[PDB]
Amino acid sequence: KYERTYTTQANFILHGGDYNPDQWLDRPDILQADLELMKLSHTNTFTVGVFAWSALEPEEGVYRFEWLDKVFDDIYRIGGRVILATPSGARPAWLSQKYPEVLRVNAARVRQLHGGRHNHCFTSSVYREKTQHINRLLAERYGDHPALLMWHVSNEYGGECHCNLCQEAFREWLKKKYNHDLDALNAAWWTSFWSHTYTDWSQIESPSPIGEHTIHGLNLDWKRFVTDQTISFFENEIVPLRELTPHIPITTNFMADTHDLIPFQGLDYSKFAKHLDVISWDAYPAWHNDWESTADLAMKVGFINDLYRSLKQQPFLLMECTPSLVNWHKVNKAKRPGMHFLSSMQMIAHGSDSILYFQWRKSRGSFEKFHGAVVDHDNRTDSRVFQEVAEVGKALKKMSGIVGTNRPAEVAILYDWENNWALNDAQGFAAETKRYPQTLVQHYRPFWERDIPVDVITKEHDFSRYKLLIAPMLYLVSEETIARLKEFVANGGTLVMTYISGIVDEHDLAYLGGWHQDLREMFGMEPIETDTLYPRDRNSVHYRGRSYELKDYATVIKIHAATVEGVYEDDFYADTPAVTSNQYGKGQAYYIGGRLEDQFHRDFYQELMEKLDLRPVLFVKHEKGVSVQARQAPECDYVFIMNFTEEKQAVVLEEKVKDLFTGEEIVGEIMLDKYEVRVVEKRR
Amino acid sequence: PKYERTYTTQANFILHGGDYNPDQWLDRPDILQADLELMKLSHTNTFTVGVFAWSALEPEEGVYRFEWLDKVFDDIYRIGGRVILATPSGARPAWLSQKYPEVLRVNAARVRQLHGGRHNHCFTSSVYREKTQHINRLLAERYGDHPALLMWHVSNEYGGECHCNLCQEAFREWLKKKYNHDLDALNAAWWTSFWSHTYTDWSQIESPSPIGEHTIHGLNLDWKRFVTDQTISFFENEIVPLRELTPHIPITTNFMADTHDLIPFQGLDYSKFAKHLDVISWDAYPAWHNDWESTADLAMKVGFINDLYRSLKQQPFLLMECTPSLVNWHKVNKAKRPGMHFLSSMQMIAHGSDSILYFQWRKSRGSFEKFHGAVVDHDNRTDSRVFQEVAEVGKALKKMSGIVGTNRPAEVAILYDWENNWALNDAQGFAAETKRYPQTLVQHYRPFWERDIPVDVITKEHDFSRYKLLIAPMLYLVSEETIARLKEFVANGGTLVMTYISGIVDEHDLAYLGGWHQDLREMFGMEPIETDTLYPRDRNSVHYRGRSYELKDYATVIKIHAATVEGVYEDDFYADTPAVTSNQYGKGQAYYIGGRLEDQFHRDFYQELMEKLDLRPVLFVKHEKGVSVQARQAPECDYVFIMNFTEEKQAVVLEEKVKDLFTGEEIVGEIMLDKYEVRVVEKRR
Ligand SMILES: [Zn+2]
Ligand SMILES: [Zn+2]
C-alpha cells in the first residue's frame, strides 16, 4: 500500500521547538529579535506555554493572556505554527501555598514542599480541577486560531504520589481489578508468604522503603496504578480539548531513561499510547562520550525510535533534542560539527515528521541556563550551533514528500513494560546483569548492521504482520500472550526466545509443573535450570563451526522434538544443548539458551535473514558504522545513508538514485565524509 | 611602613601550645599537676581553654562553677603561660537543648535534630543568642583583667545551617533588605519565570531543600550568603560583652579547610567574616604521608591555604590547630613521621603564622577524639617521640621571637572568590567532577611555589593595584564592579591572567548577554565563544613556544581581536585555532589561557612572566624540586626558611651569606639537608 498517513495538518517537516517568551516579557527587543532569528534558522513550529502557568494566571483567577495573544499572532505572521502546551508541568507558587494537597508525598511518606516541576499529586481533586479549567480557557481562547497545530499536554509525565488520597485511589483501583475479591488479590500476590495476608482493603498500602517492599504483586500493581492514574489525570486534562478542539491532535512527550537510552521505566507507554493521537519524544543521547563508539549510541537511538514509531504504526514527532549540549549530564559535551545534522537526519529516517529542540533561546538564569538552544546568550547568528540548525532547516524544507510516509518491517522485537518492571523487581539472577532492554538492543544489532527495517512492538500489536518475531527474556508472560505466540508460529511465523523467558505470569507468579505446555510444544524443548554467573565467569557455545563466548546467563535445556543447533562447552552442562530450533505448524521456534557475544547474533540472525529473505529497502554496500534507513511513499523510497563514524566511508549503490537535495543522479561508489548523510530518492 | 612589624597580640613570642581541656580531668588533680610540669618540659606557653566547657561552667541552668577555671588561669600564669579564652557556644549543654528545643537545628530536609554532637545550634534562635551572650559576659567579667588572658577564641569552627521557621522568617527579612522589598527585582535576579517559579508573595519564598526547591540557582546562592551573614550576626552578638569589657583583647575565631585537597572551607564566606575579626586563625590537618601524592604536593597545598588566610587581613595569622601526630576522623589515621612535625610547624611560621597551636594538649580518655593526636598520650610519658618533637619545636620557637609580627609582601596575587566557588559548583553544566576551581588555582600557584616566589592569595575585597601580576582563573561569576576594577588594574600597568570559564555570569548567577562583557573583550583583545567540556579519556594539546602541551577537561574556542596568538590547539574541530593569547592594554597586559594544560605549561608560561616582570624570591637558594624556600621580612632583616619536603638528602646552595637563627653560625655556599630538615636563616638588610 505505502499510502501516506499524516499526523497533523502540516504537510511539511516541523522545525523549531520549545519557545519561552514568558521569560522575556520585560525584554521586547529580544522578543522582536526572536522572529527574525526564527526566519534565519528556517524554523516554523514552536512549543509554547509548557511552564507559563504563573505567566498566564499570576494570581488565582487573574488572567494575563495578552502576551500569549501577541505571540500567536506574531508567529502566525512569519508563517509559523504553534504547538500549544497545557501548563500542568509546574504549578504556580500561590497554588502550592493555598492548596498544599497538590504537593507529593514520596514513598518514604515525606510530604514535599513547593519547588521543581513535574511533581504534582496525580490524585488531588483540586489540581485536576485547576488544570482542566486553565486548559479550557486556553482551548476557548486559541482553539480556532490558524496558527494552532497540536496540543502538548503537560510535560514529561512521571513520578508517583503516596499521600492519603492516593492510598484511597489505589485501594479503589485494586477493588476494580480484583472484582472486590480480597481472596483473589491475596492469591495473586501470594501474601501467605511472611504472613502478609490482607483481611481488610484498608490495610493495603503503596509499597515503601519504610513499610512493605517485599511483595512483588504489590510492587507491580503499584506501578500499574501509577500508570493508570497518570493516564487518568491526562484524560481529565484533555476533556475541554476534545470538546472544544476536536480538530487538534493531542500528544505528550515521552522520555528515555538516562545513559543506555532505555525506554522510560516510570510509565507504561504501551498503555499511554492508546490515549494519544500521535507519539512524541525527547531524545538526549550523550554524543561523543568515551565509553562507546558513535555507531553504538546511534544504534540505541535507532532502537528507541523504532519503538516509539511502532507504538501507533504511523510517523512520530521528535518533540525534543538539543542542537548542541544538555545541562544535566555528568559531562556536558557538545555535538561536533556535522553531528547535529547527522542526528536529525537519523530521526527523520526512523519515522519522525519533526525536528524539535529544547530549546529556542537559552534561559538567562536558573537550572537550564546552560542547556543547549538555537540561540546562545550571545544572541549571535555567527554561531556554529545556529548555523547547523539553519542547515538542518534548509534540508527539511526539501523533504516535505517524506511527511506522513511509513516504513513497514518484516522483523519485530517484542518489548514489554510490565515484564521490565517484574524482572527488575525479582529477587534472583544477578541484579546488575538482568539488563533487559539492553539485551533487546543486542538482538537488534545484527539487523541494524544490515539496514533491515525493524519494528519494536508490544504485546498490543498484531504479531502476524511479521515474518520474524524476537522476544528476548520474556520473563513475565500471560497465558493470553503465550496463546498468541503459539498462533503466530503455527500460522508460519518464526519466533525467537531466550533464557529467562516464560517463568512467571502477569501476577509475577511462577508457572508450576514445568514449562507451559504451549511453549514446550512450540519450541520442542524446555529450560530446566538458569545458571547465573559471576563477572569473571565464562562459558562458550559451539555453533556452526565456531565457539562463541558466553557471559552472565546459561540455561540447561531438556530436549523434546527439537533440533540441537549449538551446545555448551564448559561447566557441568558441557556438551548439552544450548541453542535449538523446532518446526511447529507452518512456522519455526528458536531458543537461545545463553547470553552470547555479538558475533553469535550476527551469524545466527544471518541464517534467518537468508532463510526468510530479509532485505533492506535499498541495498547499500558499506562498512560497520554506516546506517542505511528508509521511508516508503507509494511512488518512491526515501533512503538515508548515514556515516556514524569519524572516518571517511566508501559506500556502493547497486542502483541509480537521485540525491533528494541536488537532483543529481547517483550509482556506484561514493565517499561520505565524517558524519556525512546522503538522502536519496528511488523511484518505484 | 618600611617592612614594619605588626603585632596581632600582646605576645612578643611565637605562641606554642593549644587546646587544653582540664574540665575533663577535674577529678584527677594528679593529671592537672602533671600537665603543668609537662607544659614546662614541652616548652609550651599558650593554651586555649573553655572551648567545650559550658556544661562544666554551668552544670545546670543558673548554677555556675567557675572555681576550677580560676585555678586554671592562676596555674597557667604561675608557670609563665598565657590563656586563649574561648566562648563555649560550640556545644550547648543537654539541659539547654531539653528546656529550649528552639536551639536545635532543622536540616535542609526539614527534619528537626535531636540534641548531640557540636557546632550545630540554630543561628537565629533568640534564646541561644541571649544565653551565649550572657555566659560570654560572665566570662569577660571574671577573667577580662587577668594577666594570663591573651585573646578571645569565639565559639569553635563555625559552620552549618538551619532551616527552621525562625530562620525562614530571618531569610525572608534578609531578602527584603537585599532587594529593597522589590519582589520584581528578586524574581528578575533569580530568573524565576523558568518552570513557573515566579513568587507573588514574600511568604512563598523558603530556603532550598532536597524535598522542595533546589533548582533555582539564585535562591541557592542567596541562601549561602544568608547563612554567612546570619552566622556573622551570631558572632557579633557573642562578642558584644567582649568588646564592652575587654576592648584591648583581640578576638578571633578558628577557620577550616575542606577535606582531602585542603581547599578553602566552603560553608562560609571567610572573605566577609575576616572583616569582623581582629586576627585570622585556622586549623590545619594535612594528610601527611598519604599514598596518592608527594609530600611536596601536599606541602604546596598547605602553603596555598596559608597564603590565602594570611592575605585576608594582610598581617600575621595564627595557627590555632594542627596535630603533633595523627587525627581520628581520617579514612587512614597515619601519624607524622619523625621530623615531619618540626618541618610542618616551620612551614606554618614561614607563610606568616605567629603561633604553633595544637589540638590538643592531652588526649581525651573517652569519646570521639580519644585517639586524636595530642602532645600527651594516654601513657602520660615525656619519653614519647611525639612529646619530644613537640619539645624540639618549642625550643626552636623560643629562638624565633624576632619573626613575630613580621610581614611578607608579595608582587604576585591569585584571586579567589567564595561566591564564585558556590555558583560554579551549583551550576548545571560543564562536568561535575572536573570543575575543580580551588585545585585549579593551586595549579597556577605551583610554578611560583616551585620558584619560592612570594604569593598573596586574595579576594575581590583587596587592592589589586599593589601587585605586578594578578592571576584570576575560572572567575565564572564576576560583577560589573569587579570587572571595572580589573580593567583599571590592567590599564595602570597591571599584568592580568585569566582562563577558561571566567566571566560567564554576574553576581546573581545571571548569564551576561550578547557576547563577552565589553571591558573584558577590550582588555584581553579577544573573547571566548565556546567552552568545550571533555570526557576523562579525551585529550587535546596546545602548541606554545615550540612545544606541545597536553590538554584535559576544558578547551575554549576563541575569537581574536587586538590580541597576539601565543598558542594554538592541535586537534579536534578547533585545531590550529588560538588557545593562548596576550594583549597590551593601556600600560598593562592581559593574558588568556584557553585550555587546562599540564604542569609544564604553567611552568614555562609563568617563567616568562617572571622574567618579564622581574619576579624574585626574597632570598635566592639553589635547590631541587621539593625544597621550599619561604621568607618573612623585618625592617632590619630577612628571615628565610629552607624546607626539605622530600624523603631524601638534598643539596642546597646559598649565594649570599646568612646566619643560622638557631646556632648563630654564618653559612654560605652549599648545604646538605637531611630528610625533612629545615634551615632557618637570617640575612641582614
Ligand atoms: Zn497523592
Ligand atoms: Zn533556625
Q: Are A56 and A18 in contact (CB under 8 A)?
A: no
* DSSP code of residue A555: E
Block residue for cell numbers 584591648: B248
Q: Which residue on chain A is closest to B217 by alpha carbon? A: A366
A636 marked among binding-site residues: no
C-alpha cell at B606: 609563568
CA of B108 to the centre of ligand 2 (A): 11
**Among B476, B495, B352, B348, CA closest to B412:** B495
CA A453 remoteness from chain centre: 17
Minimum distance, in Å, between the CA of residue A10 and any CA atom of chain B: 29
Query: Which of B215, B433, B513 is nearest residue A116 as measured by Cβ atoms?
Result: B215
B322 marked among binding-site residues: no
Q: Which residue on chain A is closest to B201 by alpha carbon? A: A94
Q: Which residues of B touch A380 (CB under 8 A)?
A: 515
CA of B117 to the centre of ligand 2 (A): 17
3-state secondary structure at position A629: strand
Contacts of B95 (CB under 8 A, 6+ apart): B60, B61
CA of A168 to the centre of ligand 1 (A): 9
CA of B205 to the centre of ligand 2 (A): 16
Q: Are B555 and B460 in contact (CB under 8 A)?
A: no
Q: Which residues of A touch B190 (CB under 8 A)?
A: 365-366
Contacts of B401 (CB under 8 A, 6+ apart): B12, B13, B14
CA of B456 to the centre of ligand 1 (A): 56
Q: Which method resolved this structure?
A: X-ray
B167 marked among binding-site residues: yes
Query: Residue A488 phi/psi, 5° resolution?
Result: -50, -55
**H or E stretch covering A61:** none
Q: Cβ of B193 and A55 within 8 Å?
A: yes
CA of A588 to the centre of ligand 1 (A): 49
C-alpha cell at B195: 518552570
**Amino acid at position B409, single letter:** P
Q: Which long-range contacts (CB under 8 A, 24 or more apart) does A71-76 make?
A: A71/A19, A71/A21, A72/A142, A72/A145, A72/A147, A72/A148, A73/A147, A74/A31, A74/A35, A75/A35, A75/A38, A75/A46, A75/A48, A75/A147, A76/A145, A76/A146, A76/A147
Omega within 30 of 0 (cis) for the link into B10: no
Query: Residue B423 phi/psi, 5° resolution?
Result: -70, -40
d(CA A220, CA A422): 6
Pick among B209, B428, B508, B518 to test the A interface (most A CBs inside 10 A):
B428
Contacts of A128 (CB under 8 A, 6+ apart): A233, A236
Cα angle value A617/A621/A624 (rounded, 5°): 100
C-alpha cell at A94: 500561590
3-state secondary structure at position B634: coil
CATH 3.40.50.300 applies to domain A623-684: no
Q: Note the ligand closest to the C-alpha atom of B164.
A: 2
Strand partners, A496: A470, A590
CA distances A212 to A6, A191, A208, A421, A598, Å, are 47, 12, 5, 17, 40
Pick among B186, B195, B223 to test the A interface (most A CBs inside 10 A):
B195
Contacts of A555 (CB under 8 A, 6+ apart): A499, A500, A527, A529, A530, A531, A578, A591, A593, A594
CA A9 remoteness from chain centre: 24
Contacts of B62 (CB under 8 A, 6+ apart): none
- The H-assigned helical ranges of B472-598 are 480-491, 518-524
Minimum distance, in Å, between the CA of residue B270 and any CA atom of chain A: 26
C-alpha cell at B158: 563555625
Q: Cβ of B515 and A378 within 8 Å?
A: yes
Minimum distance, in Å, between the CA of residue B559 and any CA atom of chain A: 11
Q: Which residues of B touch A55 (CB under 8 A)?
A: 193, 196, 198
Q: Which residues of B touch A87 (CB under 8 A)?
A: 196
Q: CB B171: neighbour CB atoms within 10 A? A: 22
Residue B570 a catalytic site member: no
Quick one: fold of B624-685? Immunoglobulin-like (2.60.40)
Query: Residue A124 phi/psi, 5° resolution?
Result: -35, 120
Q: Which residue on chain B is closest to A109 by alpha carbon? A: B211
Strands A468-471 and A494-498: parallel
Q: Which residues of B touch A332 (CB under 8 A)?
A: 428-431, 533
Q: Cβ of A333 and B533 within 8 Å?
A: yes
Q: Are A74 and A81 in contact (CB under 8 A)?
A: no
Query: Which of B216, B529, B538 is nearest residue A290 as measured by Cβ atoms?
Result: B538
Strand partners, A659: A680
Q: Among residues B157, B389, B507, B566, which one is catalytic?
A: B157
C-alpha cell at B457: 592569595
Minimum distance, in Å, between the CA of residue A376 and any CA atom of chain B: 9
Q: Which residues of A touch B433 (CB under 8 A)?
A: 330
Q: Which residue on chain A is closest to B185 by alpha carbon? A: A26
B142 marked among binding-site residues: no
Largest CA distance in chain B: 77
Quick one: fold of A406-622? Rossmann fold (3.40.50)
* DSSP code of residue B2: T
Contacts of B106 (CB under 8 A, 6+ apart): B112, B113, B122, B162, B163, B164, B165, B167
CA distances A456 to A258, A422, A463, Å, are 19, 20, 11
d(CA A279, CA B405): 74
Minimum distance, in Å, between the CA of residue A365 and any CA atom of chain B: 5
d(CA A319, CA A150): 11
3-state secondary structure at position B351: coil
Q: Are B496 and B591 in contact (CB under 8 A)?
A: yes
Q: Are B58 and B134 in contact (CB under 8 A)?
A: no
CA distances A81 to A32, A65, A201, A567, Å, are 17, 18, 50, 60
d(CA A521, CA A140): 59
In chain B, residues preceding a discontinuity (C to N beyond 2.5 A) are none
CA distances B436 to B424, B444, B450, B625, Å, are 10, 13, 21, 24
Q: Which residue on chain B is closest to A363 by alpha carbon? A: B194
CATH 3.40.1400.10 applies to domain B407-623: no
Query: Which of B214, B429, B510 is nearest residue A370 as measured by Cβ atoms?
Result: B429
Q: CB B234: neighbour CB atoms within 10 A? A: 23
Query: Which of B195, B433, B513 is nearest residue A117 as measured by Cβ atoms?
Result: B195
Contacts of A466 (CB under 8 A, 6+ apart): A409, A410, A411, A412, A455, A493
Strand partners, A540: A549
**H or E stretch covering B30:** helix B29-41
Q: Are A628 and A622 in contact (CB under 8 A)?
A: yes
Query: Which of A22, A370, A384 is nearest residue B428 as measured by Cβ atoms?
Result: A370
CA dihedral A132, A133, A135, A138 (to 10 degrees): 170
Q: Cβ of B194 and A51 within 8 Å?
A: yes
DSSP string of B111-126?
Answer: PBPPS-SSS-B-SS-H
d(CA B318, CA B322): 11
Q: Among residues B58, B321, B522, B682, which one is catalytic?
A: B321
| Positions of E strands within B119-219 | 149-153
Q: What is the 3-state secondary structure (H, E, C) of A460-471?
A: CCCHHHCCEEEE
**Amino acid at position A682, single letter:** K
**Among B344, B351, B346, CA closest to B396:** B346
Class of the domain covering B1-406: alpha beta
* DSSP code of residue B512: P
Q: Are B471 and B443 in contact (CB under 8 A)?
A: no
Domain ranges of chain B: 1-406, 407-623, 624-685
Q: Give buried/exposed letters for B236-245 (b at 16+ CB in 10 A, else e).
A: ebbbebbeeb
CA of A172 to the centre of ligand 1 (A): 14
Q: Which residues of B touch A117 (CB under 8 A)?
A: 195-196, 215
**Among B149, B136, B393, B368, CA closest to B239:** B136
Q: Are A139 and A240 in contact (CB under 8 A)?
A: yes
B164 marked among binding-site residues: yes
**Among A620, A627, A569, A623, CA closest to A594:** A569
Contacts of A248 (CB under 8 A, 6+ apart): A143, A148, A149, A150, A151, A241
C-alpha cell at A677: 548523510
C-alpha cell at A478: 500471560
d(CA B606, CA B444): 9
Quick one: fold of A1-405? TIM Barrel (3.20.20)
CA A656 remoteness from chain centre: 35
Residue A156 a catalytic site member: yes
d(CA A585, CA A490): 4
d(CA A103, CA B108): 17
B162 marked among binding-site residues: yes
Q: Are B502 and B473 in contact (CB under 8 A)?
A: yes
Cβ contacts from A onto B, under 8 A: 169
Q: Are A370 and A324 in contact (CB under 8 A)?
A: no
**Amino acid at position B497, single letter:** V
